[PDB]
C-alpha cells in the first residue's frame, strides 16, 4: 500500500479522521525497514476502510427530501451553494428560507461527511425550525435532524443537520478551533448584528482559506445584506420573494394610561375581525402586568398568552397549537397571527460616549425593526398592524439598527474575544471595525479591573465578568461585593446606573418633584439613593395593587416603565450571579462594605479635593467638580469616588460618594505606585527607615507613612550607606 493511494483514500473519509490519519501516515516515513512500514501501511488502511464504510452507512441512511415561495430559487440556490463557497440567501417575513436551505444542502450531499450547522438567535428559534424540518422529512427526534441548545447537550451520530444558537457554535470554536464538526454552515438571522454574528462572521472569513472543503451560507431578512457579500470576496446574492399579502398599517399615537392605549388598540381590531393579536411587549415584567390587566378587563372567548425566552419546553410550544379560538400573545423581542400592536419601543444595548457607561436605554426601534414587526401579519388575508406613535414618527426614525459591534464597550468587546478565543481585536476580519483609538483604553480598564493577565489571556475574575450582563465597571462592582455581604445593594445601584435615572424632573414640577426625590437621599452618598428608594417601592408593591402602583409611579414622578426595567436588570443579574454561584444577603450591609465594592469599579473615578474647599483632582492628572445638585454638594468631604465624569463647561463628577483615603490601597495592589524617601538610622528599631508615599493613577492615598526600609530594599540600602 504506497503512501499516495492511501492519502488519496482520505478524500472518500471523515472530515476529522482525515487529519488524525495523515499525520500517521507521515509517522510512517520515519520508520526503517521497508517491508515493517508496507505492514504498518496495511492494518491502517483496515481502520481506512471501516471510517470509509461510515461514510457509506451515513450516505445510504439520508433521507429523501421533499419541498412543499422558495420553491422557485431551489434549482437557483442548489446551483449557487454548488459552485460557489460562500453565498447568501436573503428573505422576508415568510421564512420558508429557513427550513429550506438545510435540505438543499443534504440533496447537494454535504451533510454526510460533516454536519449541517445552522445558526439561530435564541435557542426557541433552534428547536422549533429542527422539529419543523424534522415533520417536514418525516423524521423522528433521534434522527437525521438534530438540536442543541446548551453546551452540555450532544447530537445523535444519525444527526445530519445540527441546529444551534449562534453562541453555542462560537463556544465550540476552543475545542474544535477549524469547526471539523461541520462540511456546511449557515448562519441565520444574521440582519440582526449582534456580537455573536458579527464575531461568526469574521471568524468564517479567517477559516475559509483553512477549508476549502467547507461551504457557508449566511441567511437574513431583506436588511440590505451587500455588506455580508462584501465581507467575503463578493459573495453570490439570492433574494427569495416572501410573497406575504399586503399589511394595512394604521398609525394610532398616544387617568392617562400608557396601557390604555393598549386597550383602546384591542377595541379597533376586535370591530374589524377576531384573528390571532400578537402584542409585542419590551421587558417581561410589563408583560405580566398587561397581561393580568387584560385577564381582569374579562373579554370573550380570549386567551391572554405571556411568552418568554425562560418559559418551559411545554409552556412554550403552546403558542403552536392550534387553539381554535383566540388567542393574545404579549410577546418580548423574540419575535397564525392576523393583527399586531406596536409601541415602538425596546430595550436595546447603547455606550454612553460623554458618561462614559454602557447602559440598556428605551429607544424608538428603527423602521428596518418596526417593518419587521409590521411583516408578522403574512396570511392569505391582508393583516393589519396597528403602530402607537404617529406617522411623521416613523419617518423620523432612522432605516436601520445600528449594529451591536458599534454601540458595546470595547472592554465588553474583548472581554468576550478572550473568552472566546478569538486573537487580538485589531486583527479580526469585522465586518464593522470598531474604533481603534478606544481599544487600547479598552484594555487599560480591563486591567484596572483585573479582568486580564499576559500569557492575551484572563482572569478567573474576567471569566465571571464575561457573564454578568451590566458594565464592566459595574460588574466588577457585583463581584467584589461577594467578599462584603452586600451583593443586594450592589445589584441595586449596578441595575440603576444601567439605566436613565428614573426619577423625573418635568418643567411644570421642578420644586415638588424634587421634595418628593429627597426623600431618599443619603448625606453622604449619592449611591444610596437608588437603594432607599428600591426599599421603599418594595413595601408599596407589596400593599398595592398593579393599578394602584403604576399611578403612584404618577405621584412620585417616577418613569413606571423605567422602574420595571430597573426590576426586569436586577433580575437578570441575579439569574448570572446564582449562576455563578454568588449569594446574596438579606440583613442591610454597612456604607463601609458597600463603598468598598463600588470602589473596584470607580477607580479612575477618585477625587482628592484641594484646600480650596471647591474642586478635586483625579487620575492623570484630571481636574473635576462634582455635578451641582449632589448629597455632598454642600459638604465636599476630602475624598471621593464619582460614578462617572462628563464634561460640558468643566470635568463634572456625577453621582458620587465619600471614601476614606485608606480603603484605597488594599484593593490597589494591582495598580499602587509606592515611592520612598527621607532614609536615616534608627537606634531602637534598629534599621534603615524610610517613609513611604503611595499613589493610584498619581493620587496620594498614602503619603507620610514610616516604613522600615532595610525590609524593603537592602541592596538600595547599603549603596547609600556608602555615601
Wanted: proline share 5%.
Amino acid at each position: 500500500l504506497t503512501f499516495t493511494a492511501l492519502q488519496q483514500r482520505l478524500d472518500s473519509l471523515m472530515l476529522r479522521d482525515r487529519l488524525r490519519f495523515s499525520r500517521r501516515l507521515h509517522g510512517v516515513k520515519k520508520v526503517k525497514n521497508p517491508d515493517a512500514q508496507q505492514a504498518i501501511f496495511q492494518e491502517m488502511a483496515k481502520e481506512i476502510d471501516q471510517a470509509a464504510g461510515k461514510v457509506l452507512l451515513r450516505e445510504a441512511a439520508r433521507p429523501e427530501i421533499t419541498y412543499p415561495p422558495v420553491s422557485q430559487k431551489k434549482q437557483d440556490i442548489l446551483e449557487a451553494i454548488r459552485d460557489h463557497q460562500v453565498v447568501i440567501v436573503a428573505g422576508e417575513t415568510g421564512s420558508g428560507k429557513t427550513t429550506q436551505l438545510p435540505k438543499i444542502c443534504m440533496e447537494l450531499g454535504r451533510g454526510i461527511k460533516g454536519l449541517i450547522g445552522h445558526t439561530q438567535p435564541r435557542r426557541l428559534a433552534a428547536r422549533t425550525v429542527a422539529n419543523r424540518i424534522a415533520e417536514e422529512l418525516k423524521t423522528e427526534p433521534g434522527g437525521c435532524i438534530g438540536y442543541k441548545v446548551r453546551f452540555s447537550d450532544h447530537v445523535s451520530d444519525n444527526t445530519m443537520v445540527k441546529l444551534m444558537t449562534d453562541g453555542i457554535l462560537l463556544a465550540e470554536i476552543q475545542q474544535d478551533r477549524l469547526l471539523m464538526q461541520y462540511d456546511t454552515i449557515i448562519i441565520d438571522e444574521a440582519h440582526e448584528r449582534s456580537l455573536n454574528i458579527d464575531f461568526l462572521l469574521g471568524y468564517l472569513k479567517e477559516l475559509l482559506p483553512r477549508r476549502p472543503d467547507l461551504k457557508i451560507i449566511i441567511t437574513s431578512a431583506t436588511i440590505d445584506p451587500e455588506r455580508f457579500s462584501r465581507h467575503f470576496n463578493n459573495a453570490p446574492i439570492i433574494e427569495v420573494s416572501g410573497r406575504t399579502y399586503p399589511v394595512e398599517v394604521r398609525y394610532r399615537p398616544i387617568e392617562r394610561d400608557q396601557l390604555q392605549a393598549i386597550f383602546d388598540a384591542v377595541d379597533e381590531l376586535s370591530q374589524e375581525s377576531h384573528g390571532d393579536i400578537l402584542i409585542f411587549m419590551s421587558g417581561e415584567r410589563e408583560i405580566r402586568a398587561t397581561a393580568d390587566a387584560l385577564n381582569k378587563l374579562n373579554l370573550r372567548h380570549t386567551e391572554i398568552l405571556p411568552l418568554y425566552a425562560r418559559l418551559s419546553n411545554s409552556e412554550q410550544n403552546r403558542v403552536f397549537q392550534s387553539h381554535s379560538g383566540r388567542r393574545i400573545v404579549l410577546a418580548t423581542n423574540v419575535a397564525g397571527i392576523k393583527y399586531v400592536i406596536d409601541p415602538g419601543t425596546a430595550r436595546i444595548s447603547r455606550y454612553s460616549y460623554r458618561t462614559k457607561v454602557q447602559r440598556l436605554p428605551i429607544e424608538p426601534i428603527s423602521q428596518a425593526s418596526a417593518n419587521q414587526r409590521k411583516g408578522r401579519c403574512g396570511r392569505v388575508s391582508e393583516g393589519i398592524c396597528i403602530r402607537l406613535y404617529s406617522e411623521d414618527d416613523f419617518l423620523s426614525r432612522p432605516e436601520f439598527t445600528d449594529p451591536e459591534i458599534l454601540r458595546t464597550n470595547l472592554a465588553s468587546v474583548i472581554l468576550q474575544m478572550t473568552a472566546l478565543g478569538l486573537g487580538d481585536i485589531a486583527a479580526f476580519p469585522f465586518v464593522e471595525a470598531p474604533d481603534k483609538r478606544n481599544i487600547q483604553d479598552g484594555v487599560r480598564l480591563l486591567e484596572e479591573l483585573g479582568a486580564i493577565t499576559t500569557d492575551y489571556k484572563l482572569t478567573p475574575l474576567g471569566r465571571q465578568l464575561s457573564q454578568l450582563p451590566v458594565d464592566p465597571r459595574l460588574a466588577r462592582m457585583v463581584l467584589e461585593a461577594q467578599k462584603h455581604g452586600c451583593v443586594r445593594e450592589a445589584m441595586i445601584i449596578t441595575s440603576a446606573l444601567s439605566i436613565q435615572d428614573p426619577r423625573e424632573r418635568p418643567m411644570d414640577k421642578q420644586q415638588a418633584s424634587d421634595e418628593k426625590h429627597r426623600r431618599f437621599h443619603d448625606k453622604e452618598s449619592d449611591f444610596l439613593a437608588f437603594v432607599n428608594l428600591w426599599n421603599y417601592l418594595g413595601e408599596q408593591q407589596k400593599a398595592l395593587s398593579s393599578n394602584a402602583f403604576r399611578r403612584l409611579c404618577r405621584t412620585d414622578y417616577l418613569n413606571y416603565l423605567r422602574v420595571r426595567e430597573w426590576q426586569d436588570i436586577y433580575t437578570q443579574l441575579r439569574q448570572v450571579v446564582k449562576e455563578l454561584g454568588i449569594p446574596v444577603n438579606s440583613e442591610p450591609a454597612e456604607y463601609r462594605e458597600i463603598h468598598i465594592a463600588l470602589l473596584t469599579g470607580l477607580l479612575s473615578h477618585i477625587g482628592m479635593k484641594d484646600a480650596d474647599k471647591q474642586e478635586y483632582t483625579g487620575a492623570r492628572n484630571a481636574r473635576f467638580s462634582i455635578f451641582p445638585g449632589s448629597g455632598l454638594f454642600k459638604k465636599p468631604p476630602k475624598w471621593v469616588m464619582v460614578a462617572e465624569l462628563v464634561e460640558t463647561s468643566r470635568l463634572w463628577g456625577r453621582i458620587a460618594a465619600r471614601i476614606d483615603p485608606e480603603w484605597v490601597e488594599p484593593v490597589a495592589q494591582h495598580l499602587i505606585k509606592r515611592t520612598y524617601s527621607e532614609p536615616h538610622w534608627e537606634r531602637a528599631q534598629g534599621a534603615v527607615m524610610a517613609t513611604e508615599k503611595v499613589t493610584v493613577y498619581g493620587l496620594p492615598i498614602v503619603a507620610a507613612r514610616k516604613v522600615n526600609y532595610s525590609q524593603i530594599d537592602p541592596a538600595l540600602c547599603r549603596e547609600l550607606f556608602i555615601r
